[PDB]
């Protein structure tokens, strides 16, 4: 698709068999989702954004669909205010900015 | 241009007579720049994201050049860690996300 920016670029994702709303965010290095259960071991990470930092749990090699496009990659879980799809997964789905 | 997302999508902007580097950020509603002077009236605003909120100054009707493309809109000024071009100005330069 071609997504314009007059409104927030929200899409549906699927993760853990569940549909969720998430923001396609070219300003985010990483993908971070609100609290949920994911399989496997996690590693610690801190991420730093407009307000300061939050602590999150890093899960690797997680199956995730973004607007119907399949990806498998790193998903961070923690107290983010919205679900954010960042560049690590935007690149998997072939997204570019164009003007 | 077509900008890939392998690295942060940073571009040169001209604002207030100054050259700055800034991030093309589809996750940002607003545009926020590190401390600088701008003309005209302003009012205070709080903006929030990862790590919470910061206080900024809101200037309206500010001319800007983003990667060679002119526009006008509201520009926020305050203690942002990164200069951010958000959707309010990305629309005006014709930027879309494509996949
Ligand atoms: C101290 O922090 C940083 C320092 C130096 C470099 C980086 C790079 C990043 C980064 O990529 N941070 C991401 C991030 O929060 N990026 C955000 C932008 C940003 C980048 C660098 C520094 C600071 C912010 C995001 O693109 C956005 O706009 N978000 C994510 S949360 C959001 C959807 C609410 C929105 C927001 O903050 N909006 C606030 C906002 C802005 C920025 C402008 C105008 C109005 C508002 C409301 C997190 C999220 C997952 O990956 C890591 O942080 C950095």
Short mmCIF file of C-alpha atoms and ligand atoms in Angstrom, two decimals:
data_model
loop_
_atom_site.label_atom_id
_atom_site.label_comp_id
_atom_site.label_asym_id
_atom_site.label_seq_id
_atom_site.Cartn_x
_atom_site.Cartn_y
_atom_site.Cartn_z
CA UNK A 1 0.00 0.00 0.00
CA UNK A 2 0.78 3.67 -0.07
CA UNK A 3 0.06 5.11 3.34
CA UNK A 4 -0.42 8.86 3.64
CA UNK A 5 0.24 10.72 6.88
CA UNK A 6 -2.79 12.94 7.39
CA UNK A 7 -3.79 10.50 10.14
CA UNK A 8 -1.63 8.23 12.28
CA UNK A 9 -0.39 5.24 10.20
CA UNK A 10 -2.14 2.59 12.27
CA UNK A 11 -2.40 -0.96 11.00
CA UNK A 12 -3.49 -4.31 12.35
CA UNK A 13 -0.76 -6.75 13.39
CA UNK A 14 -1.01 -10.38 14.43
CA UNK A 15 1.21 -11.71 17.17
CA UNK A 16 0.64 -14.75 19.39
CA UNK A 17 -2.51 -15.50 17.32
CA UNK A 18 -4.08 -12.21 18.34
CA UNK A 19 -4.89 -9.08 16.37
CA UNK A 20 -3.68 -5.76 17.75
CA UNK A 21 -3.45 -2.18 16.47
CA UNK A 22 0.04 -0.76 15.96
CA UNK A 23 1.76 2.34 14.61
CA UNK A 24 4.13 2.22 11.62
CA UNK A 25 6.95 4.33 13.03
CA UNK A 26 9.99 5.30 10.95
CA UNK A 27 11.37 7.18 13.96
CA UNK A 28 11.65 3.99 16.02
CA UNK A 29 14.75 1.83 15.70
CA UNK A 30 12.92 -1.03 17.44
CA UNK A 31 9.49 -2.65 17.72
CA UNK A 32 7.85 -2.36 21.14
CA UNK A 33 4.47 -3.75 22.16
CA UNK A 34 2.37 -3.36 25.26
CA UNK A 35 2.40 -6.12 27.91
CA UNK A 36 1.66 -9.56 26.59
CA UNK A 37 3.01 -13.08 26.90
CA UNK A 38 5.61 -14.28 24.40
CA UNK A 39 7.45 -17.59 24.34
CA UNK A 40 11.01 -18.23 25.17
CA UNK A 41 13.78 -16.43 26.98
CA UNK A 42 14.13 -12.67 27.05
CA UNK A 43 17.06 -10.28 27.41
CA UNK A 44 17.06 -6.85 29.04
CA UNK A 45 17.04 -3.62 27.03
CA UNK A 46 16.43 0.06 27.76
CA UNK A 47 14.95 2.25 25.04
CA UNK A 48 15.03 6.07 24.97
CA UNK A 49 12.43 8.24 23.45
CA UNK A 50 10.91 11.67 23.77
CA UNK A 51 10.43 11.57 27.54
CA UNK A 52 13.28 9.52 28.82
CA UNK A 53 13.72 5.76 28.92
CA UNK A 54 11.73 2.63 29.65
CA UNK A 55 12.91 -0.92 30.49
CA UNK A 56 11.62 -3.60 28.18
CA UNK A 57 11.94 -7.33 27.60
CA UNK A 58 13.63 -8.31 24.33
CA UNK A 59 12.30 -11.45 22.57
CA UNK A 60 14.08 -12.61 19.42
CA UNK A 61 12.81 -14.42 16.32
CA UNK A 62 9.11 -13.77 17.01
CA UNK A 63 6.56 -14.47 14.28
CA UNK A 64 4.55 -11.32 13.57
CA UNK A 65 2.30 -10.19 10.74
CA UNK A 66 2.11 -6.47 9.89
CA UNK A 67 -0.81 -5.41 7.71
CA UNK A 68 -0.81 -8.96 6.31
CA UNK A 69 2.94 -9.04 5.64
CA UNK A 70 4.81 -11.81 7.42
CA UNK A 71 7.95 -11.02 9.47
CA UNK A 72 10.04 -12.90 12.02
CA UNK A 73 12.20 -10.74 14.24
CA UNK A 74 12.86 -8.95 17.48
CA UNK A 75 9.92 -7.74 19.55
CA UNK A 76 10.33 -5.69 22.72
CA UNK A 77 7.60 -5.83 25.40
CA UNK A 78 7.07 -3.17 28.03
CA UNK A 79 5.14 -0.16 29.17
CA UNK A 80 5.01 1.59 25.82
CA UNK A 81 2.02 3.98 25.39
CA UNK A 82 1.12 2.48 21.98
CA UNK A 83 2.25 -0.53 19.99
CA UNK A 84 5.11 0.60 17.73
CA UNK A 85 6.40 -1.13 14.60
CA UNK A 86 9.91 0.20 14.07
CA UNK A 87 12.58 -0.07 11.45
CA UNK A 88 13.75 -3.57 12.31
CA UNK A 89 10.37 -4.88 11.03
CA UNK A 90 9.56 -2.12 8.54
CA UNK A 91 12.62 -3.26 6.61
CA UNK A 92 11.35 -6.87 6.63
CA UNK A 93 8.13 -5.82 4.97
CA UNK A 94 9.92 -3.71 2.39
CA UNK A 95 8.73 -0.29 3.60
CA UNK A 96 10.24 2.95 2.32
CA UNK A 97 9.51 6.64 2.70
CA UNK A 98 8.79 8.40 -0.57
CA UNK A 99 8.37 12.04 -1.58
CA UNK B 1 13.45 10.51 -3.22
CA UNK B 2 12.94 6.95 -1.97
CA UNK B 3 14.44 6.58 1.53
CA UNK B 4 15.08 3.10 2.87
CA UNK B 5 14.92 2.25 6.57
CA UNK B 6 18.15 0.31 7.13
CA UNK B 7 19.37 3.30 9.17
CA UNK B 8 17.57 6.25 10.75
CA UNK B 9 16.02 8.44 7.99
CA UNK B 10 17.92 11.63 8.77
CA UNK B 11 17.83 14.64 6.45
CA UNK B 12 19.02 18.24 6.42
CA UNK B 13 16.49 20.90 7.27
CA UNK B 14 16.63 24.70 7.15
CA UNK B 15 14.66 26.42 9.88
CA UNK B 16 15.00 29.89 11.34
CA UNK B 17 18.00 30.60 9.14
CA UNK B 18 19.82 27.54 10.55
CA UNK B 19 20.78 24.16 9.15
CA UNK B 20 19.97 21.14 11.29
CA UNK B 21 19.79 17.35 10.92
CA UNK B 22 16.35 15.89 11.62
CA UNK B 23 14.54 12.54 11.59
CA UNK B 24 11.63 11.80 9.24
CA UNK B 25 9.30 10.30 11.84
CA UNK B 26 5.93 8.82 10.87
CA UNK B 27 5.28 7.99 14.52
CA UNK B 28 5.34 11.65 15.56
CA UNK B 29 2.15 13.68 15.32
CA UNK B 30 4.18 16.91 15.68
CA UNK B 31 7.52 18.41 14.75
CA UNK B 32 9.92 19.11 17.63
CA UNK B 33 13.33 20.76 17.39
CA UNK B 34 16.08 21.25 19.97
CA UNK B 35 16.37 24.64 21.61
CA UNK B 36 16.52 27.51 19.13
CA UNK B 37 14.93 30.91 18.61
CA UNK B 38 11.87 31.32 16.39
CA UNK B 39 9.80 34.41 15.58
CA UNK B 40 6.30 35.21 16.74
CA UNK B 41 4.12 34.21 19.57
CA UNK B 42 4.29 30.88 21.31
CA UNK B 43 2.35 28.91 23.90
CA UNK B 44 3.46 26.04 26.15
CA UNK B 45 2.58 22.43 25.35
CA UNK B 46 3.32 18.99 26.80
CA UNK B 47 4.19 16.20 24.37
CA UNK B 48 4.51 12.48 25.44
CA UNK B 49 5.91 9.12 24.28
CA UNK B 50 8.51 6.60 25.41
CA UNK B 51 9.64 7.71 28.84
CA UNK B 52 6.73 10.21 29.35
CA UNK B 53 6.30 13.92 28.63
CA UNK B 54 8.39 17.00 28.00
CA UNK B 55 7.38 20.64 27.99
CA UNK B 56 7.91 22.55 24.74
CA UNK B 57 7.13 25.92 23.18
CA UNK B 58 4.62 25.84 20.29
CA UNK B 59 5.26 28.27 17.41
CA UNK B 60 2.73 28.41 14.59
CA UNK B 61 3.15 29.29 10.92
CA UNK B 62 6.84 28.50 10.72
CA UNK B 63 8.42 28.17 7.29
CA UNK B 64 10.75 25.21 6.93
CA UNK B 65 12.78 23.40 4.21
CA UNK B 66 13.06 19.64 4.59
CA UNK B 67 15.45 17.87 2.23
CA UNK B 68 14.85 20.69 -0.33
CA UNK B 69 11.04 20.75 0.04
CA UNK B 70 9.40 23.85 1.57
CA UNK B 71 6.41 23.88 3.77
CA UNK B 72 4.82 25.70 6.67
CA UNK B 73 3.33 24.58 9.93
CA UNK B 74 3.58 24.40 13.67
CA UNK B 75 7.05 23.76 15.12
CA UNK B 76 7.63 22.79 18.73
CA UNK B 77 10.89 23.71 20.49
CA UNK B 78 12.28 22.03 23.58
CA UNK B 79 14.49 19.34 25.09
CA UNK B 80 14.00 16.64 22.48
CA UNK B 81 16.89 14.18 22.17
CA UNK B 82 16.60 14.22 18.37
CA UNK B 83 15.21 16.83 15.96
CA UNK B 84 11.98 15.26 14.67
CA UNK B 85 9.96 16.04 11.55
CA UNK B 86 6.50 14.67 12.27
CA UNK B 87 3.34 14.12 10.29
CA UNK B 88 2.17 17.73 10.34
CA UNK B 89 5.07 18.58 8.01
CA UNK B 90 5.63 15.19 6.34
CA UNK B 91 2.21 15.52 4.70
CA UNK B 92 3.15 18.90 3.25
CA UNK B 93 6.27 17.59 1.50
CA UNK B 94 4.24 14.72 0.03
CA UNK B 95 5.77 11.93 2.09
CA UNK B 96 4.14 8.51 2.15
CA UNK B 97 5.08 5.12 3.52
CA UNK B 98 5.09 2.45 0.81
CA UNK B 99 5.30 -1.35 0.92
C1 LIG C 1 16.86 9.20 24.24
O1 LIG C 1 16.28 8.49 23.09
C2 LIG C 1 17.11 8.61 21.97
C3 LIG C 1 18.34 9.25 21.91
C4 LIG C 1 19.07 9.24 20.73
C5 LIG C 1 18.69 8.56 19.67
C6 LIG C 1 17.54 7.69 19.69
C7 LIG C 1 16.78 6.84 18.84
C8 LIG C 1 15.67 6.47 19.54
C9 LIG C 1 14.50 5.64 19.14
O2 LIG C 1 14.42 5.08 18.06
N1 LIG C 1 13.55 5.59 20.07
C10 LIG C 1 12.26 4.95 19.80
C11 LIG C 1 11.20 6.08 19.87
O3 LIG C 1 10.52 6.26 20.89
N2 LIG C 1 11.13 6.83 18.77
C12 LIG C 1 10.20 7.96 18.65
C13 LIG C 1 10.88 9.19 18.11
C14 LIG C 1 12.11 9.56 18.87
C15 LIG C 1 13.36 9.27 18.41
C16 LIG C 1 14.52 9.63 19.06
C17 LIG C 1 14.45 10.27 20.24
C18 LIG C 1 13.21 10.57 20.79
C19 LIG C 1 12.04 10.24 20.11
C20 LIG C 1 9.03 7.53 17.76
O4 LIG C 1 9.40 7.61 16.44
C21 LIG C 1 7.80 8.41 18.07
O5 LIG C 1 7.63 9.48 17.45
N3 LIG C 1 6.97 8.03 19.04
C22 LIG C 1 7.09 6.75 19.79
S1 LIG C 1 5.90 6.89 21.14
C23 LIG C 1 4.83 7.96 20.11
C24 LIG C 1 4.08 7.11 19.06
C25 LIG C 1 3.85 8.68 21.01
C26 LIG C 1 5.83 8.86 19.40
C27 LIG C 1 6.31 10.08 20.21
O6 LIG C 1 7.28 10.02 20.97
N4 LIG C 1 5.58 11.19 20.02
C28 LIG C 1 5.84 12.42 20.80
C29 LIG C 1 5.70 13.64 19.91
C30 LIG C 1 6.78 14.06 19.12
C31 LIG C 1 8.05 13.24 19.03
C32 LIG C 1 6.67 15.21 18.38
C33 LIG C 1 5.52 15.95 18.42
C34 LIG C 1 4.45 15.55 19.17
C35 LIG C 1 4.51 14.38 19.92
C36 LIG C 1 3.29 13.94 20.69
C37 LIG C 1 12.00 3.76 20.72
C38 LIG C 1 10.63 3.13 20.42
C39 LIG C 1 10.99 1.74 19.88
O7 LIG C 1 12.31 1.88 19.38
C40 LIG C 1 12.97 2.66 20.40
O8 LIG C 1 15.63 7.04 20.81
C41 LIG C 1 16.78 7.80 20.87
#
